[PDB]
Symmetry: D3
Subunit: 274 residues, 6 copies
């Protein structure tokens, strides 16, 4: 039996024997959390959720899990869980390239609170384009969507009757909104919390253009730097699925062949370590 | 006093009866960041127009300016937007705007600021500023949406590595005041049809989201700022396809600000 | 069914259907706590205490709940609880004016770790007198009582045989006592923790004068700024009830008509939202 | 070294053989707040009598004073209460007391401090100090227990808003050193029968809780401090209804402190 | 019935009626933790582990429990536990002198993450030698053992094939190891976490000399400052027991008579308060 | 440039064509501790060789040195170990080593550093340094492994109490730079057969754990540092029982460093 984790912003589902049960923990990131911390979260909110017995080898995929901060997780993951084999963890980005591309080779994009892209060559990401973040890049993410949204609403750049609703729907006030992007933690996550307002107002010819465009640019500024002219692109992540209809629409008008598009990669990510 | 500020350089000019007698220049003052007993320390080391010195944070300067400086008149500490509304509009109505490290616009009837748009900041809005230009410059260049050598010369110019540019906009202090020190790289490459279009669009946007709100079909929109002067050519060039009459566009607002208190001194 | 909360220093009782069960959480204050925090406390130490099912509309009364920091609670209270209607929260001070004055109009004073006073005009507090705090004001509170107490004991201003008992009863040492008022958090709460020593030594002709006086001044320096000459005053809060006999005594010799006096307002606070 | 301190102004006076040759004045030093390698930095930028320089924190100054200053004699760093016990009592017994930003009292037999009362602080005790006067002044005034215009003139004098006065005693640093900069408002309004009674009572209390403990029916109680001199009239006026003989009451203790080391120099 | 605690680094076992059950909490130290904290740990992770009913008098032995920080524990220990008698706590060092020397007099050394020594005179430690810490002193502890170990391994001062194993066994990398001793909390505890590597490689003629020596110096630099020439020495603590065979070996070649040596003192520490 | 650093004193020497024209001396610079806009502030208040200025932290100085200093040549900022490898080895191969507040060793082929041992730090390794000597000095003395009066004179010399020495190596900043300011107590007591053996062993160890690794049976090991010169006698005395040829042993590396850039200036 193997244990598999795919994590990041917000929660972190925890799904198998030889080909059994999922658990609902939180998101683990070693770029905000430390090691003398995650030994508690796994022992407190996970240990009583496990089916007991000795494990084999877990493969941790998730936020901040880099080839540089990887051991931060493996040094704690091992000091908390009952395993005899060994623990492995790869770039959160790889969690997609193994679940969307499995054993083959191709592009893989994770569009969540951040939009990142890779070139999976059947072995690993043979080249990456650091999205740069919800400010300089990340073009086409909840972060960048919440940003742009409030950016046009708190500026009367949209129907005056849509701002009154947005302001009351989130109960936020203009000053708080601004104080929540320049003076507080996880702005990328905050702005992103105002993402659904877009999927709830797609009738507005404007809001839809606020989503389409975002993805247009992402395609022409974040993925086109590969040999897409001869390869299919797959997707993963909230905003990616939630706007599936809208997303691929741009892919069409951008001479690129969109492929597999689903919220979580854990599906075929099970069929990778078995 | 009469002093104009802008986090970087604050030009002072003590008036006497018609013109400056002797001017100095102490680094930018800002209560939104600086401490009273730290400006009361700095200054010791009247009309005041500073950045981020809103009418709620005004009394922070008026105290530090008194303790350090000997003056028995009437102490005033207003915004940096009001300084432009005074120098660019004088006494007549106008659409005061500034394009510093952060763009801004307001409506000065002729006595005070009545209707002032709310530029969010270097992240949410500030379209058409000194920091936003960098936010777009250090972005497109670092996003391979530009030549291969232009990127090598760039980073070889500021001696900055990509993994440190990131550590300078999110992690370290002042991301907009950092994206401004990269702004110059633009004015020095207005040859490329791209880098120039990275400014035009960021200027068409400023209008299509700020000035175009006030009654512009009757009032003259006057600009001011270190980026407003540095990019004066493309400036009105942008006011070409938006349809609007651009007026007084001077770099420093101190000029017309002296013409405000030139009545009683 | 409505949910009602009255909170502040120390715990926070949580009591009804159409006119059902109380819960024992802790005190929530958005002037020391943040929003990305209270979503946990309500989900952790409250959720498993609820009777399940969808609620209607809760009315949060408590510490730091101001018309300025109010949404801090309503933005988290909503993101944690299972409600469909809407959440409401008013000044902790109002929690008294609605439970002691109900629908009528009159004065209302909360004497707890802090002494605050209002003028309820049947609609809301039509005028307030910021007590200023356990240092400049708050005259007549546990904070101000603990202060004054230790102030006279740690100065040999009281029976030398009463100081030895106080020092050992709290196991505190003079230096700790001083280090707990100038260099640590919630001094108003600490000094206030030494309040009971007064209700346990009321035989002492001195200690009682240490309580009476405190309330005398409060009446003549914190409430008399209203039209008390034609209105009845009610009370609420620990020190208010615990010293009920002593309190109203001053009210007598201060030409004012004391009225309803009870520890918590939740009683008739139920009969306000039903 | 000979130097007297008091967080605000520390008057220095290098002795030679009978009197001061040249004096200076560097801001107040206090290890209880300041860092050794920060006084060792400051000073570089012997008998020492400072505030909050208890015999446990004494070696903090003696090191910083040596590293910065060239002196091969005997380095001493004592309290600020001992400076008054020396200047006000000299060599003869006495009841040394100080009324700075924080009142204090002690008993100096004639060689050292034997019995020293423990003034708690500006919150717990310090009755009859420079900070407590403010603690009562910024309180009664802000508590409407005084005229309506007296409150308007007050806040119009220090340019402080009520919601900021709060943010200055609880939230921001040094609440007692802040309630002292408001102390002056009292000496400038001793006309009102109230403001004057806000001092008297705060002075009757000092005695009824500090000096009246030591054997006062035989020893002279000598005062000193910026508030002790500023309110000298009401001072002994309070020593009128308490029944006690008030002695040497000088503002600066440096005078009689030189008369202490005037033996060997 | 009395409650007894012996604590320090890592966990803290909690064992009796008149001469009943142990509990497994964590380590409480008032030199890193505060009082407005331990009231939670005892109420959260201990209260549901107790056999209920009113207690008599607990005797807290453990980290940071000094005659100066003692009340930090007794002020919280009392405000959390259901006791009517009184609480007592002595130097963690004394926890050994009462369990190894009981009522008699003699030396007592605690060799754990830190090596401390005392002279128990039947009444109390009549003289102490502050070990000074895992840097200037503590000679002969896990701290000092982990230190010395990594000190010779990360310097190729040992078999090159033993370093590759150490580095992979702890999954640590040289830079992390250094960043974990100069820039992070509880280094004494970290370095000490690499202690077992020594008890797992005692075959190496070198590693054993890395342990023997450590204890040799400890004897000749930390305990010999007493009248050992006429008194027996007892031990307590992890590294003390784990290397029992190796330890006393030095005692032999150091003209000193080693005596009782066992991991925890709680054994006879029960037979002290009964 | 040419400047050598070492957290304490950084000696500057502006070269012209063959020798120093005028030298200064500003406190030690170190990005590993100091902030760019804090060195850009400091300096304003080329070849650079500093402490803890690894090739990863090099661009931190090269920017601050440019903003503050006017220079249009080629800006370099290298380690402090490379400065010794250049001054002690010049152009010919050698075993560069330093014995400052932290010992170090490396192998300079004749163009750069190829094989550099990794001295851990003042706690893990650094055997044979300025801080480690204190780590052993403030330890054995405070461990009664030395005379009774030697301990009294010691603490009476630095005016430090045992319970504060602890608060200076674990709790307070810079434990190795603190254990260096105690280093001098050794050179002033090389009479005792013990204190001298506390250095020898700490020097035999340096060799038996650092230099003895490189091919020492053919290359000359050159030293440098404030502790390397202060203890020059015992130095080579230790190189007596370890069997190794000690070469250029100069206190400051600036001498031979000028002989490096004396080619083009």
């Amino acid at each position: 039996m193997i244990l598999i984790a795919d994590s990041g912003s917000t929660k972190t589902d925890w799904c198998v024997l030889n080909g059994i049960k999922r658990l609902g923990t939180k998101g683990i990131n070693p770029f905000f959390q430390s090691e003398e911390e995650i030994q508690q979260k796994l022992t407190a909110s996970l240990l009583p959720q496990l089916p007991e017995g000795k494990f084999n080898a877990v493969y941790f995929y998730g936020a901040g899990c880099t080839p540089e901060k990887a051991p931060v997780l493996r040094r704690a993951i091992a000091d908390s869980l009952p395993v005899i084999g060994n623990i492995k963890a790869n770039s959160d980005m790889l969690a997609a390239a193994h679940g969307l591309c499995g054993q083959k080779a191709g592009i893989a994009c994770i569009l969540g609170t951040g939009s990142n892209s890779c070139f999976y060559n059947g072995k690993e990401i043979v080249s990456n384009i650091s999205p740069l973040g919800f400010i300089l890049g990340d073009e086409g993410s909840g972060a960048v969507l919440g940003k742009l949204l409030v950016g046009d609403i708190l500026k009367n750049q949209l129907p005056a009757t849509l701002k009154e609703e947005f302001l009351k729907q989130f109960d936020l006030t203009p000053p708080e909104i601004i104080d929540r992007v320049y003076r507080q933690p996880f702005p990328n996550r905050f702005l992103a919390s105002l993402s659904p307002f877009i999927a709830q107002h797609l009738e507005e010819p404007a809001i839809r253009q606020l989503v389409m465009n975002s993805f247009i640019a992402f395609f022409r500024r974040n993925v086109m730097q590969y040999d897409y002219k001869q390869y299919p692109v797959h997707f993963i992540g909230s905003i990616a699925y939630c706007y599936k209809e809208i997303l691929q629409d741009a892919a069409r008008q951008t001479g690129i062949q969109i492929g597999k598009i689903l919220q979580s990669p854990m599906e075929g990510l099970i069929q990778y370590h078995s």
